Design a protein around this ligand. Structure first.
Ligand SMILES: *[C@@H]1O[C@H](CO)[C@@H](O[C@@H]2O[C@H](CO)[C@@H](O[C@@H]3O[C@H](CO)[C@@H](O)[C@H](O)[C@@H]3O)[C@H](O)[C@H]2NC(C)=O)[C@H](O)[C@H]1NC(C)=O
Ligand SMILES: *[C@@H]1O[C@H](CO)[C@@H](O[C@@H]2O[C@H](CO)[C@@H](O[C@@H]3O[C@H](CO)[C@@H](O)[C@H](O)[C@@H]3O)[C@H](O)[C@H]2NC(C)=O)[C@H](O)[C@H]1NC(C)=O
Ligand SMILES: *[C@@H]1O[C@H](CO)[C@@H](O[C@@H]2O[C@H](CO)[C@@H](O)[C@H](O)[C@H]2NC(C)=O)[C@H](O)[C@H]1NC(C)=O
Ligand SMILES: *[C@@H]1O[C@H](CO)[C@@H](O[C@@H]2O[C@H](CO)[C@@H](O)[C@H](O)[C@H]2NC(C)=O)[C@H](O)[C@H]1NC(C)=O
Ligand code: NAG
Ligand code: NAG
Ligand code: NAG
Ligand code: NAG
Ligand code: NAG
Ligand code: NAG
Ligand code: NAG
Ligand code: NAG
Ligand code: NAG
Ligand code: NAG
Ligand code: NAG
Ligand code: CL
Ligand code: CL
Ligand code: CL
Ligand code: CL
Ligand code: CL
Ligand code: CL
Ligand code: CL
Lengths: 480, 485, 479
C-alpha cells in the first residue's frame, strides 16, 4: 500500500494531425472532415437518374441528329459528345437552352406538325444531306423537316400550333442559307424569300442571306437554329415562302428548378447521392470536399486541402497545463478503459482504472465539438458549373472569380479552424489530467509524498476500500 | 475558527448559450448578436421615402398606363416598392427593350421631373394627334393611351416625313421613351401611315438606331394582333436627340429630367409606408442595423447586417450560473454565491466581528473591461456598405439569374457557419476566462496565507490564528503581514 | 542567502498589438500581416511587361488612331486617366468591352497587312479616305489599320475579297461600316443610294445595311462609322462583299491569347521590376495574406481588406494572463535577460546573472514560427484580374460584380481582424503558460530545500554554488 498515480491513455495509433504550434502530432484517435474520395459513378439525384447523352451533345439530341426518359435530375455529357449540328450554322441562345433543359420533371416528344398532312404543296421527303448521314445514307434531323419545292414552285405556307396542353412546349426550327443563288432557286424557286415566326411573346422575321462560305462538313451553306417556349394556351405561327426548316417534333415539358450539366467519363449505376461531381458521386455528410469544384446537389464546400483531420483522442505517448508530456511524461497503453485515470499498488494488488466521470465528460465535449464543426454547415441544392459562349468572356471570368473566391475563403477557414480546434483539444486533455492530479493531491494532503511524475506514495496502508475512496470524492483524511 | 473563502457570482438568470464543448449552458448574463425581428413597415432610406407603385409596375408607371397615377409630386426616392398585385404594365402588347436595365437605373433618383418634351399641340402640325387610342389601353370604359406617349397617324390622307429634335438644356440626364407600332396586316399599315414600307430613326451623340415595322398577324393579346415595341435612352446634358419617321412612330410626349442615385433596388412587398426611418429595409419590413447578423430576409436594401440562417447567436458575457479548463468554477468551488451582489469574483469571511460577502473589484472590473472589448470587436469589426441585394433577370438570362443565386447562397453559407462557430469559440473562451480569474484569485490568497491557514478544499481557508477585520482586509488588499502570525 | 528566480524577457520595444480582451498591448516583438505599401511602379507579371497605352485607349490603338503609336507579348494592359484618343470618327464599337478583355493578355501578337492597300481594290479610290475628325500633324488623316474606299471614275463596283488564316494562330480582323449624314454624301462617296456590306467566315455571318440620317455632330461629323471585329480561327476564311460604305481591313493581328488578365488605369510608370501582384498604385509584395492598397489587382494577390493594422505578436507582452504568472505573481520582465524568452536569475557567493532556459525558449520559438507560417501559408491564391468593365446597358452585371467584390471585402476584413485578435490572445496566454510551467518545474524540484518568496524567486536554505545552480537549471538537482 505504497502508491497511486494519475495518468492518461496511450495506444498503438500512428494517426497524425497538425495544430497551431506543431505539425504531425501523433494522436490516439482522429476524425476526417474532408471528403476526399468518390465512387466513380453517375448517381441519381433527388431519386431521379440523369439524362446520359453519350456520343451526342444537347444540340444533337434536341434537334434529333440521326446519330442520336420522362424525367431527369441533371444532364451528363461525355468528352466525346461530338454529335451536334451536323449541318453547319448558328444555334440561337444555345447556352441558355442547355441550362433550361438541365432538369425536367416531365418530358414528352410529340409530332407538332405531322409530316404527311401539314405541307400538301411542298416536297417533304428529299430534304436530306450527306452532312447528316446515318448508316451510309444521307439523312437529316429527326425532329425537323426540310421542305423543298414541288412541281416547280414553293407556295407560301401559313401554319400555326396552339399549345392546348397543360405544360410548356419547346418548339425548334431552322432557316436555311444557301451557298449560291442557283441552290436557292432549285430548292425554293425564288431568289428573295422570307420566314416569319410569331407567338404572343416571340416575333421574328428571317431573311436568307446567300453567300459562298467556307465549307464545314462539306457544306458551303448554313442553317441557323431557333427555339422558343410556348406557354399553355399560347399560339405559334409559321409563315414562309422558302428556306424554312420546319418543326416536325416538339417537346412538352415541365422544367425543374436549377440543375446543370456534367461532362464525365463516369457511367450510370444503381446508386443514389445528394452530391454528384464530374468524377463521381461523393458523400455529403462532411463539410468539405477536394474532389471537384463543379458539383451538382447539396454538396460539401470545395477546398484545396489534402488533409483536414481533427484530433479526438490524446497525444499518443506509449501543453498549456504542463501535465501531459510534462510532469506526467508518458501515457499508459495498459489503461484500456478510458482517457484519464489511475494506477495503484497495495498489498492486495495493482492495476489501471479509468476515471469514468472525467472521461465521459470529455467524450461528450469532444463529440459536441466535432458535431458542431460538421452540422453548422448550411447547404442548398446548387449546380456550380456554368457555360458561356465566345462573346461572354467577362461573365465567364466573373463566374470564375466567384468560384475561386469561395474556394480561397473555405480553404483558409477550414485549415485554420482545424489547427485551432486541434490545439484546443490537446489543451483540454492536458487540463483534465491536471485537474485530476490536483483533486487527488488535495485529498491526500500530507498523508502521502508527491513523487513528481504523477504518483503519490502513501505514509499509511491504503487498502482497496481506501483506494476506491480516492477515486471517489470521499477520501477519509483524518481517519488515517 | 475564522475563515475566508473565494467565490463567484450567481443570480436568477435563465439565459442559455452554446459553447464548443456543451450545449445550452445557463449563464448569468448574455448579449444577442442577431437581428431577428422587423417592424412590418416600408421605411425611409437615407431620409427619403420609397416610390410606391401599388397596382402598377415600372413599365406601366413610366410609360403612363392610364390606370397608373402620374404621382407628379414625388421629386426623389431611395428605392422602389412594388406589390405582388403590380399588374398594370404595357397595356398595348409588345417588347420593352432592356426593361430590367431600366428598372435598375430608375431604382433611386435624387431629383425627378416629368416635362413635356414634344408639346402635343405644336410639334406635329401635319399629323393626326387625336385618334391614337385603343381599347387595350382603356380607362373609365373609354379607349385611351399612354399618358407619356403620342400615337401619331396620317392627316388629310398623308403621313409626311417628320424631323423633330430636342436639345437637353436641363443640365441633368433626360430619360426619353418611344415606341414603334407593328401592325397586324398591310391594310392597317396603309390606313394609319399611308405607305407599306416605313421607317423610324432615333439618333443622338451616342444612340443610333433604325426601326422598321414588321407586319404580321399575331395571336391576340389584350385583343390586339398588332404589337408595339418600347424603347428608351438617357440623353446627356447638352446633347440632342433627333426623331425621323414616315410612319409607325409612337412619339415621346412627356420625358423625365432626373439625377440617378447610386446602387439601389426594387422591393416586392405587402407592407405599407409609415413615418419611420431605417438604415436597412427588407421586403417584410425594416430592421435595425446595429448588430452584425440578421435572419429576416436575404434581399435587403441599405447598410445591412449580414444574412444568416441562424435562429440564435448569443454570446455569454457573465458566468456559468450555478445558484472548466482551470478547475475552479463548477470544480473545487462547487457553486456560486447569489448573496455576492457587487461583482463577479470575490470573498466571504467569518471572524468574531461578523461574516459577509465582498466582491474583488479589481479582478471584476478588469474582467468587465475585457468582456466589453470582446463583445465590441465582434460587432464593430463588421464592415458594411449600401447594397441592394436583389436582382431581376428576364427569361433569357437564366444563367445570370443562377450565378446571382450562387453568390447570395454562398455568402449565406459563409456567414452562417462563421457566425455560429465564432460564437461557440468566444463563449468557450469567455467561460475559461472567468474560470481563470477565480483560480488566480484563489491562488493569490493561498500564497499569502501559506501555513497560517488550513485549506478546506472548497475555496475556503481556515486560519490557525485570529483574523480580525484588519487581517481580513490585508488579505483582500494583497498586503497580508505573514511574519506577524 | 542564495536565490534563484524565474522570469521572462523584456526590451525597449514600442510595438503594440490588439487582443481579444484589450487594445494596444505593448509587446517585445510582432510581425505584420498586412501589405500597406506599393512601389509606385508598373512591373512585369509572369516575367512579361504590360502594354502601356498612354494617350490612347484600346479602341484608338487597335483601330490605329493616327495619334496612337503602332507596336510582342504582354501580361496585362495599362491605360492612363488621360487615355482620350479612341474612335476619332464617331460611332459604335461592337462588343468593345469583350474585345478589351480578350486582348488583355497575349503570348504572341503581330500586326500584318491582311489586304494590301495598293492592289486589293483595283477600281476604287484608295487614297482620299481621310477626315478632319482624324487629323494628325495639321492634316486630315484616318485610322492606320482601316482603309476608307471611295468611288473611282463615277462608280463603286462590287467587291469580293477573302482571306485564309494560314497563321497557325487566331487572327483579329477589324472593319467598319460608314453611315453618311445625307444622301448627297452617300452618292458622292459610293455612287449608290442603297448599299450593303457582308462579312462571313466558318463561325461569323453578318450583313450590314448603311442607314442615312441627320445626327448631331460629334467631332464635327454628322455621319457615323460603326466598328466590328471577329477572331478568325486557324485555317478558316473570312469573306467581305460590298458595293458601298465599307471601311475595309488594311491591317489585322495574328495573336495567341493568354488566360484571364485585365486592364489597369494608372498614374504609375513602368520600371524594370518583377511582381506577382499589380495594383493601379504600384506593384505589391505577395508574401502576406492581406493588402489594403486597392481592390482591383491583377496577378496572384493578397486578399483586399479595409484594415489599417493587422499585427501578430510573436514576443511577450513588454513590461520593463490566464495563467497568472506574467504581470501576475512575476510582476515585471527582465531587460537584462538578452538570450531568450524565459529563464533564470540567480545569486550566490560567486555572483549573479541571467540565463535563458534554452529548452523552453526554443520550443516556444518553434511553436510561434509555426503559428505565423500557418496564417501566411494556408492562404490559397490564383492568378485573377479583379477589375471588370461594363457598358451603360449592363448596370445589373456591374452591380452584381460590385456585390461580389464588396462581399469578399467584408468577409476577409472581418475574418482577418478577428483571427489576429484571437491569435494574439492565445500567443500571450502561451507565453504566460510557459513561464508558469517553468516556475512549477523549479518549485517541485526544490521542495522544502528553499522558501517561496512570492515574486518568482526561491531562497535556498543551504549554500547553492554554481554547480548547484546549474543542476536546477538543467533539471538534475538532487534534493
Ligand atoms: C457524329 O460524330 C462522329 C464522330 O465525331 C462523326 O464522325 C466523324 O466525322 C468526321 C466528318 O465526316 C470525320 O472526319 C473526316 O473524315 C474524313 C474521312 O474520309 C476526312 O476525309 C475528312 O477530312 C475528316 O477528317 C471523322 O473521321 C469521323 N469520325 C469517326 C470516328 O467516324 C460523324 O460525322 C458525326 N455524325 C453526325 C451525323 O453528326
Ligand atoms: C486625340 O486626343 C486629343 C486630346 O483630347 C484630342 O484633342 C482635343 O480635341 C478636341 C476636339 O478637337 C479639342 O476641343 C476643342 O477645341 C476647339 C477649338 O480649339 C473647339 O472648337 C471644340 O469645341 C473643342 O472644345 C481639344 O482642345 C483637344 N485637346 C488637346 C489637348 O489638344 C484630339 O482631337 C484627338 N485626336 C484624335 C485623332 O483622336
Ligand atoms: C436548456 O436548459 C434549460 C434548463 O434545464 C431547459 O429548461 C428546462 O427543461 C426542463 C426539461 O425539459 C423543463 O421541465 C423546464 O420547464 C425547462 N425550463 C424552462 C424555463 O423552460 C431548456 O429547455 C433547455 N433548452 C434547450 C434548447 O436545450
Ligand atoms: C390594369 O390591370 C387590371 C387588372 O390586372 C386589368 O383588368 C382586367 O382586364 C382583363 C382584360 O382586359 C380582364 O380579363 C380582367 O377580368 C380584368 N380584371 C379586373 C377588371 O379586375 C386592366 O385591363 C389593366 N388595364 C390596363 C390599361 O393595363
Ligand atoms: C494495434 O492495435 C489495434 C487495436 O487493438 C490492432 O488492430 C492491431 O493489430 C495493433 N497492431 C498493429 C496495428 O500493428
Ligand atoms: C393564316 O391562316 C389563318 C387562318 O384563318 C388566317 O386567319 C391568317 O390571316 C393567315 N395569315 C396570313 C398572314 O394571311
Ligand atoms: C477521361 O479519360 C481520359 C483518358 O484517361 C482522360 O484523358 C480525360 O482527361 C478524362 N476526362 C474526364 C472528364 O474525366
Ligand atoms: C462517493 O461520493 C459520493 C458523493 O460525492 C457519496 O454519496 C458516496 O457515498 C461515495 N461512495 C462511497 C462508497 O463512499
Ligand atoms: C430575477 O430577479 C429580478 C430582480 O429584479 C426580477 O426583476 C426578475 O423578475 C427575476 N426573474 C425571475 C425569473 O425570477
Ligand atoms: C430597433 O431598436 C429600437 C431601440 O433599440 C427599438 O425601439 C425598436 O423596437 C427596434 N426595432 C425592431 C424592428 O426591433
Ligand atoms: C404577401 O401576402 C401573401 C399572401 O399569401 C404571401 O404569400 C406573401 O409571402 C406576402 N409577401 C409578399 C412579399 O408577397
Ligand atoms: C493596501 O493596498 C494599498 C495599495 O497600494 C496600499 O497603499 C496600502 O498601504 C495597503 N494597506 C492598507 C492597510 O490599506
Ligand atoms: C533598443 O535596443 C536596440 C538593441 O539594443 C537598439 O538597436 C535601439 O536603438 C534601442 N532603441 C532605443 C529607443 O533605445
Ligand atoms: C498605445 O500605447 C502607447 C504607449 O503609451 C501610446 O503612446 C499610444 O498612443 C497608444 N495608442 C492608442 C491607440 O491608445
Ligand atoms: C465571290 O467570288 C467567288 C470566287 O470567285 C464566287 O464563287 C462568288 O460567287 C463571288 N460572290 C459574288 C456575290 O459574286
Ligand atoms: Cl482514444
Ligand atoms: Cl475547446
Ligand atoms: Cl452577470
Ligand atoms: Cl481559442
Ligand atoms: Cl478571450
Ligand atoms: Cl522578443
Ligand atoms: Cl496557440
Amino acid at each position: 500500500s505504497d502508491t497511486i498515480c494519475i495518468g492518461y491513455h496511450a495506444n498503438n495509433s500512428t494517426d497524425t494531425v497538425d495544430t497551431v504550434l506543431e505539425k504531425n502530432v501523433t494522436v490516439t484517435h482522429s476524425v476526417n472532415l474532408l471528403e476526399d474520395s468518390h465512387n466513380g459513378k453517375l448517381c441519381r439525384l433527388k431519386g431521379i437518374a440523369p439524362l446520359q447523352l453519350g456520343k451526342c451533345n444537347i444540340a444533337g439530341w434536341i434537334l434529333g441528329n440521326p446519330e442520336c426518359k420522362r424525367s431527369w435530375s441533371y444532364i451528363a455529357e461525355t468528352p466525346n459528345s461530338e454529335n451536334g449540328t451536323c449541318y453547319p450554322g448558328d444555334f440561337a441562345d444555345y447556352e441558355e437552352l442547355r441550362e433550361q433543359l438541365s432538369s425536367v420533371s416531365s418530358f414528352e416528344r410529340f409530332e407538332i406538325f405531322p409530316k404527311e398532312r401539314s405541307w400538301p404543296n411542298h416536297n417533304i421527303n428529299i430534304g436530306v444531306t450527306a452532312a447528316c448521314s446515318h448508316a451510309g445514307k444521307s439523312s437529316f434531323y429527326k425532329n425537323l423537316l426540310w421542305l423543298t419545292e414541288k412541281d416547280g414552285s414553293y407556295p407560301n405556307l401559313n401554319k400555326s400550333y396552339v399549345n392546348k396542353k397543360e405544360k410548356e412546349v419547346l418548339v425548334l426550327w431552322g432557316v436555311h442559307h444557301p451557298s449560291n443563288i442557283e441552290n436557292q432557286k432549285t430548292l425554293y424557286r425564288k431568289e428573295n424569300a422570307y420566314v416569319s415566326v410569331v407567338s404572343s411573346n416571340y416575333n421574328r422575321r428571317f431573311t436568307p442571306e446567300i453567300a459562298e462560305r467556307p465549307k464545314v462538313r462539306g457544306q458551303a451553306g448554313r442553317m441557323n437554329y431557333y427555339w422558343t417556349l410556348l406557354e399553355p394556351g399560347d399560339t405559334i405561327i409559321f409563315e414562309a415562302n422558302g428556306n424554312l426548316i420546319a418543326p416536325w417534333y416538339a417537346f412538352a415539358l415541365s422544367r425543374g428548378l436549377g440543375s446543370g450539366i456534367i461532362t464525365s467519363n463516369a457511367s450510370m449505376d444503381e446508386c443514389d447521392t445528394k452530391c454528384q461531381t464530374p468524377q463521381g458521386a461523393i458523400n455529403s455528410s462532411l463539410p468539405f470536399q477536394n474532389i471537384h469544384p463543379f458539383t451538382i446537389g447539396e454538396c460539401p464546400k470545395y477546398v484545396r486541402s489534402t488533409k483536414l483531420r481533427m484530433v479526438t483522442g490524446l497525444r499518443n505517448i506509449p501543453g498549456l497545463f504542463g501535465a501531459i508530456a510534462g510532469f506526467i511524461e508518458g501515457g499508459w497503453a495498459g489503461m484500456i478503459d478510458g482517457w484519464y485515470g489511475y494506477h495503484h499498488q497495495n498489498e492486495q494488488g495493482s492495476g489501471y482504472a479509468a476515471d469514468q466521470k472525467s472521461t465521459q465528460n470529455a467524450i461528450n465535449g469532444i463529440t459536441n465539438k466535432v458535431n458542431s464543426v460538421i452540422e453548422k454547415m448550411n447547404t442548398q441544392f446548387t449546380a456550380v458549373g456554368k457555360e458561356f459562349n465566345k462573346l461572354e468572356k467577362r461573365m465567364e471570368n466573373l463566374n470564375k472569380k466567384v468560384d475561386d473566391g469561395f474556394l480561397d475563403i473555405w480553404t483558409y477557414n477550414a485549415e485554420l479552424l482545424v489547427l485551432l480546434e486541434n490545439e484546443r483539444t490537446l489543451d483540454f486533455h492536458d487540463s483534465n489530467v491536471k485537474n485530476l492530479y490536483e483533486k487527488v493531491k488535495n485529498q491526500l494532503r500530507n498523508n502521502a509524498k508527491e513523487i513528481g511524475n504523477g504518483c503519490f506514495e502513501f505514509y499509511h496502508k491504503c487498502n482497496n476500500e481506501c483506494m476506491e475512496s480516492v477515486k471517489n470524492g470521499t477520501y477519509d483524511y483524518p481517519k488515517y
